[PDB]
Structure formats: C-alpha cells, structure tokens
Design an enzyme around this catalytic site. Structure first.
Site: not given
Ligand SMILES: OC[C@H]1O[C@@H](NC(=S)N/N=C/c2ccncc2)[C@H](O)[C@@H](O)[C@@H]1O
Ligand SMILES: OC[C@H]1O[C@@H](NC(=S)N/N=C/c2ccncc2)[C@H](O)[C@@H](O)[C@@H]1O
Ligand SMILES: OC[C@H]1O[C@@H](NC(=S)N/N=C/c2ccncc2)[C@H](O)[C@@H](O)[C@@H]1O
Ligand SMILES: OC[C@H]1O[C@@H](NC(=S)N/N=C/c2ccncc2)[C@H](O)[C@@H](O)[C@@H]1O
Lengths: 810, 810
Positions: B351, B542-543, B548, B650, B654
């Site tokens: 992710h 968003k966070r 960002k 995501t 939306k």
């Molecule tokens: O895919 C769904 C969303 O995931 C989000 N990742 C988030 S909330 N945390 N990841 C945390 C993480 C923790 C440890 N190792 C890797 C990632 C992405 O930032 C976003 O682009 C994407 O749309």
C-alpha cells in the site's frame, strides 16, 4: 409434575415453545444443528426474561404515580446466585417451561446448570441482602437495592493437593441476560482534589472524575406481579481521561479498576485505598440517583418522609457525610437542618462484634481521597462529643471512647461510631447479638440514646430456600396445608398436628432420602467420589473462620476415627462428614484448616478397617448454587461457633427449613431457633456467653483440657507427630501451637460436651421414626425465620411503611 | 419517496412497525413515555438486524454444503463506519423503514445520526478492507474478513484554540447491536517462551497464553441474499492468569490490553511491542480458525485449493511463518511441502513506497516474543538467499539487498521481503504504483520472480459511496438508465449519451445544489459556522501528511487572499475552501499544519474586505460518516500529492462518483481516472514522476523558487513575520524551515502550475452549463473504480475463484 411448580396450560406451553425458537434463531443466530447447550440456556433465559418486562415497567410506573416512601438498601454485596429458576418460581412458570423444553427434546435441569452464579458477595451479609430484596418485592415495598457491578465476584475455589487455589470468577464472560444497562443515568463521582472556603461556603475543587454507569436487574416478587429493581454501578473513565496517546488510553484501566473485583474478606477489615474508593463510589452515585428521584416527585423537610436509606453494615457509612455534603455545600441548607434530615433518613445494621472486622479508616487516607468528607466527619464528631459532655459532665474517658476519631500511632475514623451518630435506628441481627451490642461494644451509645437500639432477627426467603431447592418437601407440605405458607411461613405451625401422622412421617423421610440420593449422584458425576447414601449426612458449610470452629468439627471426626480403630468390630452409626467453604486468600490459618480437613479425609477415606462407616469430604467451591443442592440433602446441621461470636447465622435457618436437625451452641439465631422448636428438639451443647465471660476472667488455659482429656491428648499427639502428614511431619505445627497457646475461640473448652452431644445425635438417628418426628417439629416451627417476617419488622419499626400482599394487575 | 430506496409495501411497513414496538418493549424495556432518542435508534437497529439472520444462517450453511474455496482477508484495520443505513440499502428496506418510523412519529435520519462509527481503521487501507467486504458479498464469494475488535478505534478529534486534541473513541460504551459473540470458538494464542529441540522436531514451550474470543459481524451483499462474516478477535486473560489476590485479578488488564486500542499511524511504522503482539494475535487466532474449518471439510496438498489468505499490507505478515510453524511443528509436514502450501496459499498487497512506513521489526523483539517464528524466518531467508545466489552467481550486493534480515546497529527483519518470498502474488494498488514497485523498491524481487508481480487498481463500493450517501444522484441516474448499474457500475457509460441533454444537465446541477444546501445547514446546526452555498466547494479531506501536501493547498489559499487584498474591487469566483483530516498524535509537523489551516481561517474569515468571497474551514473529526456528508457536497476534489507518493488514493474515486471535478497530480489512481475521463475533463498540473526524479538528480533547491516567484516570497514572509500568528510571531518557524531547507515533497516546485490550474478551475465554474457537462463526463466514466471490478480481478487473477451475481433463495 408437582403442584407447587404451577400450571402447564396448553396455550402457555405452545407460546413458550415458539418464543424459545424465536430467540434461538433471532437472538442467538443458531438453528438446532449447531446450537450448543449454552445456546439453549440463553434461549430459555431470554424467553423467561420476556415475561418480566410488562410487570417491571408497570411496577415502576405505579411507584412514580403513587409516590410511596422509597426504601434504598445500600450494600457492597448482593449474593444473588442463579436467576433463571428463581424467576420461573416467582412467575409460576416452572412447570410450563419444563413441559415446553421437554417437548423440544431438552432437559431444563441440565440447562439450569449452565448459568453462572452472580457471586457478588462473600457469605452471610451478601446473601442476606439478596433474601431481603426477594422479601421486599414479595411484600410490595417500593424498594431498590444499590451496589456495585463487580466484573469479578467471589473467586472460584479449586482444591489442589489438599490446598485452596483461587481463580478469577469471570462471571460476565458470556454476557448477563438478567441486566439492562441504563446509560442515560450515568453519573459523575469525584475523588481527591481539595477544599476551598469562599464567602458562600466550602467548595470541593480540582477533583478527579470517574463515571458511574448503572445496570438494572429485575427483582420479581412471589406471584404478586411486582418487579423491583436492583441497580448496580459500573466504573467508566471519562473520554478525555489522561488526554503518550496509547498509554493514556491504556491508563483508563486505573479508573475502571474501582468496580473490577469484590474484596474476598468475610468478617475482616483490610484498610486498602481501592476498597475505600469502592465504598465512596457506590455511595456517591446512589445518593445522586436518590436525590434526582426525590426532586422529580426544593423542600428537603419532606426528604425523610419519602426516603429511607438502610446501611448494610458500615461499608456504605460514607452515605452520612455525603448526604450532609450535598445538603450543606450544594443545596445550601443550614447544618442543623441537614443533620436532622440525615439522621431521620439513615438506619444502620451491624453484622459482627469481632474487633478485627470493624472498619477503622486511617485519617491520612480520607484526607487525600475525600478531603471535604473528613472535614464534615470532624464537625459531626465535635457536635456529637458536645452532646455527650452535656449528658455526662466530667466523664472524660467516655468522651475518648465515644469519639468518631481514634487516637494512636495512626489516627483512625471509627465508621461504626459514625453510623450510630448519624442514624435514627441501629439494629443487631439476632436477639442475643442486639443485647451484646447494648451491653458491650456500643454500651456508651446505648446509654446516650437508648431509643436508637433495636433488634431485627435475620431470616431467609422460603422461595429460594424451600420451593426452589427442595420442591419435594414443598409439595408434601402443600398437600396437607395448601400453598399459602410460601408467603406466610408461620402457617407451617399447622404441621404440628401431623407429627403422629404415619403417612406424613413416611413422606418427610422419603423426601430426605431422595434428596440424599440425588446429592450422592451429583458427587459421583461431577467429582468422581463415592458415598454411602444410608449414612447420616453431617454437614458444616459456611466460610472458613476460626470463630466458626471447623476445627472443633475436625476434632470430633478424629475422635470417631480413633474410636473405630480401637474397637473395629463395634457397631457405629455410619456418617458422611461434609465440610465446605472458602477461606479469604490472605487468611493463613483458614487455609491451614482446609488442608487439615483434606488431610484427615486422605487417612480416613482409605482405611480398610473403617469401610463405609466414616467418610470425610471437603465440598469444593461452596457458593449459593451448591448450597441449594447440599442443604436439602443434610441430616445434621453444624452450627458450632463459640458463644457470642456468630451475630446471627442464616445457614442455620436454611437447614432447619429443609429437614436437618441442628447441633449447635447457644449463639446468634441458634438461641431463637431452639426457643421456637423447643430445646428438646435441638442438640444444644457447650458454653453459654456467660461461661465464656467467666473463662476470660480466669484466663483460658488450653493445657488443662489437654492434661485431663486422654482422647484429646491423643489427637494433639497425632497432629504434632505427623500422623496426618507422613512426608511433612510438622505441617500442622501452626494449628497445634494456636490450639495450645493462643486460641481466642476456646476449641478445647467445648470439646467434651460436643462429643457427648454427637453421641446423642447418633442414638436418635438409630430410631428413624423418632428422628423424623423431631425433624417435623423443626420444620413446623421454622416460620419465624422467614425474611418476610424480618422485612415486615424493618418496614414497620424502622422505615415507617406498611407491607402489602395485594397483587398488582397483570 | 425515491425509487432506488425500494418498496414500502403495506405488509412490510405493518410488520416493521410491530417489530419496532416489540423491541422497544422487550429488548429495551421502555415505553414511548420514557424512551430516549438512543432507545429509538436501538429499537430500529434490532428490527433491521432481525432481517439479516435467516440469510446469514443459510449463507454459511450453503458454504458448508458446497465447500467452495474460501477467501480470508486478513487486516489489522476494517474502517466500517455506520451499519444501519448500509444494511437497509443492501436488503432493500430503506423506504419501508422510513415509512414505518414516519408513521410512528419518528425521523429516521435523526435516528441514523445516533449510531457510532465503527472506526477500526486510520484511512485508506482500512476503508479499502471495508469496501472489499461489501464487494465480496455482492459478488457471492465465500469470503471472511478477520481482524481485531479494538475497544477504542481511531480517536475523536477536537479542535481547541486551533490545535488538534485527541479523545478516546469509546465506541462500544452503549453496546454494539451489529455483533454476535462466539464464545465456543475461543482459541489460545501463545507468546514468549522458548524453543526445545527434541528427537522429533522443535517444540515451543513455557509460553504465556492469551485467549482470543471471536465476535461475528454480518456483511450483507447487495440484494442477493448473501450475508458473509467479518470475524474480529478480542483478547481475554485465562482464569488462572497470575493465579496478592487482588493485584493478580487487576493484572488481567495486561493481557487484555492487546485488543484495547488501534495504533493511530497512517503510513508510518512504530516498532512497539504491543503492536507486534496485536499483529501476532490476529494471525495466530485466524490461522487456527482457518485450519479448523479446513479439517471439518489430513491431506494438506489440497489446502491451497480450499484456502486463499490475502495479506492487507505486511501487518499480518506473521501468517507466513505461523503457517509454516503449524505445518512443520504441529502437523509434521516436511519443510519443502509446507513451504509449497504456504506460498500457494498467501498473497500480499503493498500500500505504500514511503520508506518510513515499511515494517522492519528489531530481531531482539521477535527473539523474546516469538522465538520459534524468528528461527523459521532465518530458515526461510537462508533457503531464499540460496535461490538468489544460484540465479545471480557472484552478485554479493544483491544478496544483502534481498535479505529478509537487515544488518546495522540493530538487526531488523524486513517484513515486505518476507511477504514477497512467501506469497504467490504481490500486487500494488494502482498501475503507476505497481510499476514503481517493479522498477524501484522491489526491482531485485521482480527480476528473480517476475510472474509474482501484479496490479490491482483500488476501487470503492458504489453502495455506500453513491446509493447510501447520495440518493438524489443515484435516482436521477436510475431514471434514465435503470437500477442495474448499482452492481454493474460500468453501465454508467450510458450517461455519455445524456451529456447534451438539457433536462439531465439541470438535474445533475440541481442534485449538487441540494447536497450543498444540506451540508451548509449541517455546518450551522452542529458547528455554528456560516457558509455561502453558492460558492465553489473546494475540498481536501484525508489524513494529514506532508506527502498529501495540504500545505500546497494552504499556499494557494493565501495567494487568493493576497490577490483579493491587492485588488479588492475585482470580481473573483467565490470559494469555500474546506480542509479536514486527522494527524497522528506523535506527528508534530502534521499537527502544525492543522494549526496553520485554522490560523489562516482566523485571518481570512474575519477580514471585512474579503466578505463571503473566500472562507476557510477546517472540518473537524473527519471520519467515514462525515465523508458520506461532505463528498456529495463537493465541487472540487483536491488530490495533490507529490507524484510517486500516493500509491492509489480512494477518496479521489469517491469524489469522481459524486459529481466533483478533480484538481490533481499524475499520481496513484489519478492517472487512471484521467485516462478514463479523458485529460480534457480533469484538472492536471505539476511534476510527473519523471520530473521529480530529474529534480532529485540535480538536487532540490527551494530557494530558487522563493527567489523567482514574488507571490511565493510574500507568503513565506507573512508566515515568518507572524502575519498569521500576531501574539506568537515565530509559531510557524518549523513550517517555514521545512519548506525552505528540508522539503521531501517539493511543495514550491508545483506551486506555480497549481495556482495557474486553479485559475482554470475558477474560469470553468463561471460557466455552470459547461461545468456540469464536464461533471457528467466524469460520473459517466467512473465505472472502472468500483470495488466490484477490483474484487473480480483479485478473484480471477489471484484467488482462482469465479464471482457470481446470482441470488441465493430468500
Ligand atoms: O490502498 C488503499 C490506500 O492505502 C493507503 N495506505 C495506508 S492508509 N496505510 N498504509 C500503511 C502501511 C503500513 C505499513 N506498511 C505499508 C503501508 C495509501 O496511502 C493509499 O494511497 C491507498 O489508496
Ligand atoms: O444480552 C446480554 C446483554 O443484555 C443487555 N440487555 C438488554 S439489550 N435488554 N435487557 C432486557 C431485560 C429485560 C428483563 N430483565 C432483564 C433485562 C444488557 O444491557 C447488557 O449489559 C448485556 O451484556
Ligand atoms: O447478618 C448476616 C450475617 O452477616 C455475617 N457477616 C458477614 S458475612 N460479614 N460481615 C462483615 C463485616 C465487615 C465490617 N464490619 C462488620 C462486619 C455474620 O457473621 C453472620 O452472623 C450473619 O448471619
Ligand atoms: O445487544 C448488544 C450485544 O449484542 C449481542 N448480540 C446478540 S445477543 N445477538 N446478536 C445477534 C445478531 C444478529 C444479526 N446481526 C448481528 C447480531 C453481542 O454478542 C454482544 O457483544 C453485544 O454487546
């Protein structure tokens, strides 16, 4: 099957069955293919609980509309046991549910065994609160029980290698169907902080806040359509609590620890801050709730006309300064008026005279935790001592004896003195106990205000303690005298005219034998132990304490064993000696007593010469649901406390009602039981209170008894030499040392009379017809010991309200 | 009222009304006189939940009988939001419930607002899990979500003096009607201990045990009568735990702390032991449950044919060595066979590429907590590195780059490397992200095993994110093209033939205006803030993260303010700029960014010259239920991450679905969105990934931009001099220092292009007809971004199962 269990109407059974299926499906999300036995219990509990709701809503509605005087029973303990059967009994649903479940292919008794006890008490004081709630509902009183919803009740006792082990009673693990959370009545409770004095009174500021969230449990009266409320408080941190981030969330546990666990001390004071927090928590939340309900009826003159607060011992004694605090600091009443209201509102029940049990809180604790309450207590004490000084001029020692503040190394507040000062009524729990209060520990108070001191002899509810646990006995009684006795226990006197009735004699004996067979079968199945059901069932069940003298029972047991060993081919009346009860985890001597009992059993139960003539069994995990099983099965009730030590006892009354004879000292309610039954129908032995007093004046010398009683010397020599602990010869040295040199309870002094009296018990048991006739004379005179009688006396003599047996409409 | 909300049949409404009354009475123990608004919500929740049970039981029955391949989605986060409306939508009950409650004199929307969000996630990754569960149920897959039942979810955000404050999200306080505890499936999880090597394999001994108790939540598919399960584990101490007595009971909190709280880090790794315990806890309990279900179908060759495990990032990476542990140590499979089974069973989704987010656990932690897993990880690494050495002989640097074990001060395990080694499929979450994985951070792995690497572009569920939150839009679409698009979102393409339809243009614009009015009214009522509903709603939610680039948005806002101040009497398109999102409590810069936003608002919103032409509002406590309100109201979606940093996004999808235009960089799924809509219908600006790479090679010098852009210099000078913080002149010095000297995300580099692009946004908004036509072209091409498409691709390309839109019988 049996009449007192109610009707199994066609419509009722059909409706129960469909509601059971509806709950299994919608509530439990199961069908019959995957449903566990626990699922079936819950389906049934939900089905039964549905029958309470209409009555519960309308009872509380009725109180709101009629506005009667409300009774608030404050206790840190409510020892409820199981709820399912009790609810069925009080709603007349037992036979209908039995039929409904039978038709569904289920055994209801098996389902009943799945329910956890609500073990929110230690023993007598907590069970008394529970019996009282049942009687108050049955007598149509507008009564509320208020306490704490402990996450962990009294520990489950396991016996490992003859030793007590404790495990957490996680009674809420599967969820409690008998409660309803009431989040809208969540209330703040304050701790710590400091007192500021302003132009307009004292103010308590900078406090830490813990939330009190109430859970309501229904308390159904016996077939009168009344359902009262027991409201228990649970501790919750506020959301901004301690608000690095993760730690602050984890630290919420600190605040919520207040309602985590019941202190497992029976008749013993432990001055721990967490316990003090529990005591204030219940009091502060409860009083706010009381005041809210009173205002939703400004004029606090009418407060005592609409409110009674009963303090179950001193545990909720902080109610007195808390009420003053709210009235003076928050409502702005003058002191003298607030005090008048307080005294007229509060009444105090004492449950023991043992000095180690009395609550004496260090001043420094109250200073930190409750600064405003300490100031209020000081003010109460000053005004009280000024009254004493005026009544007894120049009596300076009386002033120090009566003070709420005790001097010494650490200054302490005597909570019992606080309770007497701030209550319009003080009662003991049996006639001899109440007399002892006036003559000894509260003598100074009695001389100042004699009108305050009353007696209210304890009682037990005949619903749980006869109809529920002993339906066979309830039925054979109802067959002769009807069903009215269940809520008018004095009617049992009518049984006196059946004492020479051959059919009744046979039926009484038959019910006992059946109960004994059932209990003997319970012991094999759940514990793999073998007992002779034709033996005399000799039982002592109650918390383990030196004053209760399980040790004297042990001495008798060893005496019987030694006598058999000396003359193996002599006939003796076979006995099963059963002892059970929990020891407080920090009480070493009590833990040693348990080990001794099991050690005796290990020798006695495996001696080939003894055979099935003597068996000694320790009943593990004694609790309300176990009492319901063993008490109906007992032949002989052991009530053998040193005279002047057991305030009342209630286990004694349970055995009397269920057809056991009593061997006992003239202590607590045993005195009144012997009075009701006649002394010829009771096995009385041992020192009276006066004899104990005489011995204390002379000095108790245990050695004298050891020197003059050869059978006693033999036992002590066996204990000392390691006869009962071959691989640890000195295991019981602490027990021997105590008996020989520092026995507060004079075990040896009653030994000879006890053994002789036990011989007379064996003699009577040899004549089954005469044994049973004496039993009938006990059951027939057990009526006084109904908690309905007790509650009727509290109502009329303390609370100023009239009981009513009239039905509310259904 | 509106068609897509379903039928309100006479029988249905009547039945709902009576079931509502039944629950109010029997379940909630209330009547209409005392019932609180919360009581009404619960009565409704229970009434709706009753409709799930039959379908839930029969779905699970069907899986048991048909034995399809089961999909296990493992996540530490499931960001569910509210459940009531979603359940009504998926069961076609919304109109019927609205009618039933209306007739009872209640407003259903008001009742809906009472429900707490299930906030068991941080943002994108957690919400993705939730959308996936909805799509898997809708596509008839035998799927289970497995995670942790946190007692506290993501903190509630309060803004005090412009600063973020955190408070505990006590979401279970009133009880969760949407779960069913499953105590019969309680399972032991082991920690600590040590490894013994015997004649017959390794053994993990002397462990501490924590119990895992499951709670099941239903996951209904969209009108297909499928109800799948999300199973969440709660930590429970065993009863003999630590078993002076009181302390031992209180210490149970230590074990139960495992499931207490969600770690509030979005895209950031914190190497804390409690977090590691959470990760193992979910994995160990889940795998036992999987294996149990598999055996209740010995031959583990068929395990991958009946089981797929999807790892949502590396958080559940311990599944790989845990599966090996069970197969080798407990089932006695040889290593090579166990490994084959493991690889074929597991798949891994990445992710993010941000290095600070990657899980790299210290060896010493795993050594103490999970000694057997560490040994298994070492063995995996040895065999893996032996494969690399054989493929790339003599490439010694590749060996150290690919190792699961990282050398340095503290040795660490790279969990991403573990996941790649032990999974048959590795996917990124948007095309550009998956390409970046192959080209950069996992390049070595891609060269070894190219077949493992896939793309699965993210998606969102059109049930929650269109039908539920924007029924007005759903309806005007259904009026032209029917209802089928709700589970076949590609059908939205048909809307392209309405782009010149004057009625449709007017309806699209009307729905947006209505949404904006409703949201403007929400802001006044619940927050007492005034906004112009005719302004362009410019939103970034968003966070809060540096990547960002909420800061770039801030720079634009200040630019607009300065331009107005310079030429006050010039017309500008009015804007309401809304920024919202939570900052991780330990992330200082993110907390400073929030303060900056509020500080800008404090100046801008009170400048008389500005008027209602510019308003800056910080949206407090952004969460799923708030997204459902603001997203339908937005005109302009800010998706402005530095190219190469947002894996997918995501929130972007939306907004596209709900009729906002997008201003964005070519980053994550923005690239594919622009591709679907056409670049002419997207506001694209700024550096591409290649441009960022070029800048990194040269070295990024922020000073150059400051020197050459006068408007930018002015803003930096205002920030530095205290224009936005008069009483604390240097408040934002950390922000200025970062932008000028250590900006990883090149805020200044995209500034000029961003402002220009924003001018083009304002120009289009001036022409409402052309604004709306471009909107239609976005909605019409949003179909690819349905999570139904995403899940269909996982199913076919990773899990080896076929989706089905066929109904189960009702
Ligand atoms: O895919 C769904 C969303 O995931 C989000 N990742 C988030 S909330 N945390 N990841 C945390 C993480 C923790 C440890 N190792 C890797 C990632 C992405 O930032 C976003 O682009 C994407 O749309
Ligand atoms: O099911 C377990 C849960 O039940 C809940 N009871 C609810 S919803 N209604 N009860 C109604 C009721 C009616 C009559 N007599 C007692 C309770 C309790 O609030 C909760 O603490 C407990 O965990
Ligand atoms: O009246 C009901 C029963 O209460 C019992 N008291 C118990 S369980 N605890 N008291 C604890 C206590 C604690 C602090 N200060 C005084 C007493 C009495 O021992 C018993 O005779 C009586 O039948
Ligand atoms: O009422 C609050 C309590 O509900 C209980 N749910 C029970 S009794 N049935 N649910 C059935 C159900 C049916 C359909 N979809 C979800 C749940 C939960 O076990 C408990 O954790 C929670 O505190």
């Amino acid at each position: 099957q049996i009449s007192v269990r109610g009707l199994a109407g066609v419509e009722n059974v059909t409706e129960l069955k469909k509601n059971f299926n509806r709950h299994l499906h919608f509530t439990l999300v199961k069908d019959r293919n995957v449903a566990t036995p626990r699922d079936y219990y819950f389906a049934l509990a939900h089905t039964v609980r549905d029958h309470l709701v209409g009555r519960w809503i309308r009872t509380q509605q009725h109180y709101y509309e009629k506005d009667p005087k409300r009774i608030y029973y404050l206790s840190l303990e409510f020892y409820m046991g199981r709820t399912l059967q009790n609810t069925m009994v009080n709603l007349a649903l037992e036979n209908a549910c039995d039929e409904a479940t039978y038709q569904l292919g289920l055994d209801m008794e098996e389902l009943e065994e799945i329910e956890e006890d609500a073990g929110l008490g230690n023993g007598g004081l907590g069970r008394l609160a529970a019996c009282f709630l049942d009687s108050m509902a049955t007598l149509g009183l507008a009564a509320y029980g208020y306490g704490i919803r402990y996450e962990f009740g009294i520990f489950n006792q396991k016996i490992c290698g003859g030793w007590q082990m404790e495990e957490a009673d996680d009674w809420l693990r599967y969820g409690n169907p008998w409660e309803k959370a009431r989040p809208e009545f969540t209330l703040p409770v304050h701790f710590y902080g400091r007192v500021e004095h302003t132009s307009q009174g004292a103010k308590w500021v900078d406090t830490q806040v813990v939330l009190a969230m109430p859970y309501d449990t229904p308390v159904p009266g016996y077939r009168n359509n009344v359902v009262n409320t027991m409201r228990l408080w649970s501790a919750k941190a506020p959301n901004d609590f301690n608000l690095g981030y993760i730690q602050a969330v984890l630290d919420r546990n600190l605040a919520e620890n207040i309602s985590r666990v019941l202190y497992p001390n029976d008749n013993f004071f432990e001055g721990k801050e967490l316990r003090l927090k529990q005591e204030y928590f219940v009091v502060a939340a409860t009083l706010q709730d009381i005041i809210r309900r009173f205002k939703s009826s400004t004029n606090f003159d009418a407060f005592p006309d609409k409110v009674a607060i009963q303090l179950n011992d001193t545990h909720p004694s902080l109610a007195i300064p808390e009420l003053m605090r709210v009235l003076v600091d928050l409502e702005r009443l003058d002191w003298d008026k607030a005090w008048e209201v307080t005294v007229k509102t509060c009444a105090y029940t004492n449950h023991t005279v043992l000095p180690e049990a009395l609550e004496r809180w260090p001043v420094h604790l109250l200073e930190t935790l409750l600064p405003r309450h300490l100031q209020i207590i000081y003010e109460i004490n000053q005004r009280f001592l000024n009254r004493v000084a005026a009544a007894f001029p120049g009596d300076v020692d009386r002033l120090r004896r009566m003070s709420l503040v005790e001097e010494g190394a650490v200054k302490r507040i005597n909570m019992a003195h606080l309770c007497i000062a701030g209550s319009h009524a003080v009662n003991g729990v049996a006639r001899i106990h109440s007399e002892i209060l006036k003559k000894t520990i509260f003598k100074d108070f009695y001389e100042l205000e004699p009108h305050k001191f009353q007696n209210k002899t304890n009682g037990i509810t005949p619903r749980r303690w006869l109809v529920l646990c002993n339906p066979g006995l309830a039925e054979i009684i109802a067959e002769r005298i009807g069903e009215e006795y269940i809520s008018d226990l004095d009617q049992l006197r009518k049984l006196l005219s059946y004492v020479d009735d051959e059919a009744f004699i046979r039926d009484v004996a038959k019910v006992k034998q059946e109960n004994k067979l059932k209990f003997a079968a319970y012991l094999e199945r759940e514990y793999k132990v073998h007992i002779n059901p034709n033996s005399l069932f000799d039982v002592q069940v109650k918390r383990i304490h030196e004053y209760k003298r399980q040790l004297l029972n042990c001495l008798h047991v060893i005496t019987l064993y030694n006598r058999i060993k000396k003359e193996p081919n002599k006939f003796v009346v076979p006995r099963t000696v059963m002892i059970g009860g929990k020891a407080a985890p920090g009480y070493h001597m009590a833990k040693m007593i348990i080990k001794l009992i099991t050690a005796i059993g290990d020798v006695v139960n495996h001696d080939p010469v003894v055979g099935d003539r003597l068996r000694v069994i320790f009943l593990e995990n004694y609790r309300v649901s176990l009492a319901e099983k063993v008490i109906p099965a007992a032949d002989l009730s052991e009530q053998i406390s040193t005279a002047g030590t057991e305030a009342s006892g209630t286990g004694n009354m349970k055995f009397m009602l269920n057809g056991a004879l009593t061997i006992g000292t003239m202590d607590g309610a045993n005195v009144e039981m012997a009075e009701e039954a006649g002394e010829e129908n009771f096995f009385i032995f041992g020192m009276r209170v006066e004899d104990v007093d005489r011995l204390d004046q002379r000095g108790y010398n245990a050695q004298e008894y050891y020197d003059r009683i050869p059978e006693l010397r033999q036992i002590i020599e066996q204990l000392s030499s390691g006869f009962f602990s071959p691989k640890q010869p000195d295991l019981f040295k602490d027990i021997v040392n105590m008996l020989m040199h520092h026995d507060r309870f004079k075990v040896f002094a009653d030994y000879e009379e006890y053994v002789k009296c036990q011989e007379r018990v064996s003699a009577l048991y040899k004549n089954p017809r005469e044994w049973t006739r004496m039993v009938i004379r006990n059951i027939a005179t057990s009526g006084k010991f109904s908690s309905d009688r007790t509650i009727a006396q509290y109502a009329r003599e303390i609370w100023g309200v009239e009981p009513s047996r009239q039905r509310l409409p259904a």
